Design a protein around this nucleic acid. Sequence first.
DNA 1: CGGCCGGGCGCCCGGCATGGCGGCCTATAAAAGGGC
DNA 2: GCCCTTTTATAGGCCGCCATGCCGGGCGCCCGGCCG
Length: 1447
Amino acid sequence: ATRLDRLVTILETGSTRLIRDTAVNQLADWQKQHPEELFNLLSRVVPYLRHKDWETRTTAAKAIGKIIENAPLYDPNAGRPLLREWPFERLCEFLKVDLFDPQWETRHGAAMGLREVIRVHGAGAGRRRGKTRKENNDLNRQWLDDLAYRLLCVLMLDKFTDYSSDTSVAPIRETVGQTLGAVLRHISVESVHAIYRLLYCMVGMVGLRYVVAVRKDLLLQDGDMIDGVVRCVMQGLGDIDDDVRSVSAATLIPMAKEFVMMRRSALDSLINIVWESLSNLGDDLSASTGKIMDLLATLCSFPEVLEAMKVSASQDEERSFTLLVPRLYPFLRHTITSVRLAVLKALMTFANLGGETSQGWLNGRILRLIFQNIIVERDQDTLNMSLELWTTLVRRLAARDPAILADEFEAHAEPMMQLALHPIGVPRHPIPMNPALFQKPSGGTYVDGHMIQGEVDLVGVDVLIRSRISAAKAMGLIMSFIPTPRLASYDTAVLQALSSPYASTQLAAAMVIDEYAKNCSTPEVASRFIEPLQKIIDLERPSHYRDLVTYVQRVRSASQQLINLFRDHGKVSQGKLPTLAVVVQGEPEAGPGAFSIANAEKVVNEDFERLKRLMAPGQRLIALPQLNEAREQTVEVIEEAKAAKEARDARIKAAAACALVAMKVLPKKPSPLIKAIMDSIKTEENQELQSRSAATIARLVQLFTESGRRGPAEKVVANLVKFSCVEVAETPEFPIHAHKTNVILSMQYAREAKAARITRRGAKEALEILSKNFGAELLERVPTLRTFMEEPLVRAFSGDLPPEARDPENAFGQEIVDAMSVIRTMTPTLHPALHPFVMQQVPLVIKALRSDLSVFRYMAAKCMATICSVITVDGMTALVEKVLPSINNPLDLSFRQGAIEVIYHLIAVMGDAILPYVIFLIVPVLGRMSDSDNQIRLIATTSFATLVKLVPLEAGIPDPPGLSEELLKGRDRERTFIAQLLDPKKIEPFKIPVAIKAELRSYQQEGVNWLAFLNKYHLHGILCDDMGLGKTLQTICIVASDHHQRAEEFARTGAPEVRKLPSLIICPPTLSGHWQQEIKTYAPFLTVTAYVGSPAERRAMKDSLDKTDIVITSYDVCRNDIDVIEKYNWNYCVLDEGHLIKNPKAKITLAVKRLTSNHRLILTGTPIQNNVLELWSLFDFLMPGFLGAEKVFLDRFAKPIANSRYSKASSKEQEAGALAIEALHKQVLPFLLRRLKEEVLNDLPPKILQNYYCDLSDLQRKLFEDFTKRQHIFQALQYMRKLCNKLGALRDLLVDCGIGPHRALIFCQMKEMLDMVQNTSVSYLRLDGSVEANKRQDIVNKFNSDPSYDVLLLTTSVGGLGLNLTGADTVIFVEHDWNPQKDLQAMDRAHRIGQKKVVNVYRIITRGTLEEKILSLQRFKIDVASTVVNQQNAGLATMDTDQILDL
DNA sequence: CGGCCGGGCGCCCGGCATGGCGGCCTATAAAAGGGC
DNA sequence: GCCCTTTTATAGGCCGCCATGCCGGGCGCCCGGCCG
């Protein structure tokens, strides 16, 4: 596949918007470089316009526009409703012909595409070559008129609308309007007249939005064509329907500037109609008022509109701002959020007008209404806008005079203070505010019922608390602005609140004090609130709060149940205990003897013991278990009440401490202040108060640093660093993972999970604000953080390793990870001045990534990912120069593991930013997908799933500006590296030109070329050539070349990448003598070891395995000794006859697949013999996971292959098998190199095949017919095989073959037929395996030399490779095996390179019996095997390799 | 005493096609309104 | 039976897969011997 096919698919399958933006940019640049092939891109991007996904259609339209923008401009001269040559002529016609399609997606795409095409190329449309210039201009006018006509017809017929949101959306209308706006830029003014007449000024409006706003400067002041549109818009504004009003308002707002400039006269009528339409209180569910107010704000922003409005109030004040803008006040509490937000934004625009008009309507009314908005709001955005408007209004009102602010809000201050300092209840027992405190927009006393009532169950407690803090900020600001002598009521209100029986009111009072302190000119002003706050934090807290009366009453009910019901059950007489106090503590008019938690403790312990002692004997035994249950329940309720009291006390203390630190108090004895603040950093579920406490600590540290005292400062910094590391998911508990080694951590009570993460959230926010405060100087001001971060990093350097570092009970094993978490936690928020510090520490983090400690590698991967995210160029230089080189180390498993986990986390954190470095990252992941370690393979697969999608973009990403010279050189060399993989072009093969090195034939040259290609990119294969082509030479050549290259590189480097690792070869016993001879005669500079030996002898060379370059071992010697052989690693691992390991269940496969090797190769001649699962078993050894698990491969390939055995060209079965073989062929294409003996050898005569058919004998026929009436299924097959036994055919064939000058081999699968002596001159030998193996060589060598022997009989399965029987020129088969490859091997005897004459093969196939099925199965297996290996060569192999590694 | 011995048997080969564990997947349960 | 919404959640059956074979045929290993 080309680059374009993968580049276009990103527009639909792109993971993020930036990836698709880069895809369209790359595609546009592609068209720029290759301007001759616009249609190739267009034909592939256009079909997305009718896709169902919205984003795909938008991206396809943008891609079409940017592709077309680079082509040259063209200048060849010098009422059915819609419900759910010119170079681009056919494209535009295809868009217009489905612009009336029923499906709305097609219309949306068509409109977008037409817009994009015409936007850049509208001028040259419609013209035809050969016509004159002027007539072509007329044709262009006709074309644009036709397009405008068709688009306007589309606009007036489409009714598709979306009502999901309040503001209805018409996608087709909007796109068609933008298409008109694109069209109308190029036409002449006559066509503009025609279109304006067509879209007559009546009420289309969305059509008007782009019929104007194009050719704007010429339409201005153009008589009727600009005078009628204002009438149309004004009529629309006054219309009844909300939809047309909203559309007209949205149509006028972008054109408001030039519609204002059109006339000064029209402004009076326009603003009159706008204010009149807004004056009428619209329907409750209408979002139109937002558009109307946006229009009002935009119109009032222009100076001439302000002049007109000032002129309008000529005879009276009716049209002045002061009387009008209160018309906006009713909509402040409208149900739809958009209307409320619009009201606030319009009021802010009006407030920021200036011009001495704002003083009119600014008064206490709007301030009180905005304060009510703050109190009763639930939406975050509207609350923020309300507080912003409040601040701007207060600042504007204080600009005139602080006294004006102080006495304007004096009328309203006390009720708003009651609202701000109001308590909060519990879910089912609210504490409602008085509705008389709220004013109406046009009334003295009051949709917001839930917030007023204080119903915490219906509106969450977070919303109530947020309203309280917002009110506190507003009231603190307004206190700060107004003069001090006027603050008597304010200060006494908050002082009385600080002593209230409630808990919430005290919190609100502290918040108001804190905000007043913050907003003051200097902190000393607010010093009158000092000692009440110190009384809050120092003096003991109240024993109760009115908010917890529900808890105490629950305790009272449970205690009463315990006292009463279970003693009635227990039969204890009256007078058992005095009755509990009826009134609970904390309630109003509760006496000093009111029920309290202390009474609950007394009854549940002392009275419980007393009553137990008072119970009669025997009845106590009956009663006690229910008494125990009731007692435990009572204790639980008491604990709940006490916990609630503790939480309220802690919150009040935290707020008081925040107030004290805010006014710059630094007590000489800071014992309780820091305690309260840190308690509110630990156990604060409310995010807002936690952030406030975080800011409090960040300011406290700075104040103490300026004071010079540092004890508590360092203590709190240490405590913050401690709390930042409490979350398990961000820093694990070392005592658990101390026992895990060489495992990827990334692949591996409910109450506490929340506490840990909230504490870590608070600490992290505190640390971030601290860093932002200190700026550049943080590394100078505070050194305790430095020690926490750094002391285990400079420790453990130079290979240092305390033995206690591995001790689960040593705290330093946890302190190491606690230290290393802070780098990730803090580096992104540090100043750039500290980037050199982290850069200087990167050499420590990289070594932590190479360290053999698993948690070291985990934390180093995380920290390197972060550092490369934020300190991009330096961190990535370190990564590419000193991590990725280590990814290939065979022995250092830690190096590879850490260096792959770093890539995992780097991708996960950087996301889209990793585009320029995928060229560095791709090759390591490709290599490690097939690594020996299981978890490295898994995470490499996950990383590759992300990198492959971005690989097509890497060829054109703009270089980052700051890349070091090393990174530019790295990018260049990696480009040249990948170019050979992703291009069919290839290089001269890899060879070492040693003087004694042997000569290579052409096919061997191609084979070593293929092996070197595999070697470079760390891919594995099968050299499945036919026997007799010399695979040993190629194998030892590539192994020696690799060993020579590594050894030479080890002299030019010091890294542990090269270690002179051994190489293992597993052969059958008979071929070791060939392997050693070939290695010695072709690679003298290689050393050889032969582990194959007696069971005891192997210990004499056990340690010699790790000391010799090439090690040779047998399959069975490896099997019996795998438990010791698995403990070594090898550079190469070669299986000489890999068809031994085809059955996955066989123990030889289980043994061989445990051989951890860097490179891995199978030599064979029949990778697939009976079933594709043989190929799966081989590739499970070569590239684990490449073809999936067992079930996946079975379902994908094997079942269709089996089902295709019986088919008659039917689409039900033939198609499935064909697709299965095609997929398996494409998947395994680059990793098999089959070359036929016919292609290589120049001297090997042809082989001919003929079948011999004969009918079954009479006696055998009768016996079979009898047997049909007559266990296991296979015994019938065996019996049929036996009774099928030809001798006349064999006799006639032998006589025809000159026997009894001509020779033959006779193969029989059945031994009992091979010894038959029927037909009573012919001398024959027998080789049936039962003969001793040594005697076989003598027999065959006797047969081979002299011509006195005419025939030689043998069974098919006798002898392995090398059983050369060359004298024969005919081969006769009498019974055929289930395996066709065994018959082919039997034919290969007497067809070797030493063969001299033509070889003819004959088969005796008796008709109407099992043998026909045998041959049918054989040809089926032959076809299935051959079709999978049909086309194998380096150049012929498809270079889409990256797209295959997806299981 | 050293060295080649036979010698046994565990391992793998291959067929068809049956029976016994599988994982996984709705379905299980509750209220209720509407219409078919 | 059919559908919509919602929080809760886990264990039976149904369709598959999957190792079962068992007669000759062979290879390779170690495990017993002895021979001049």
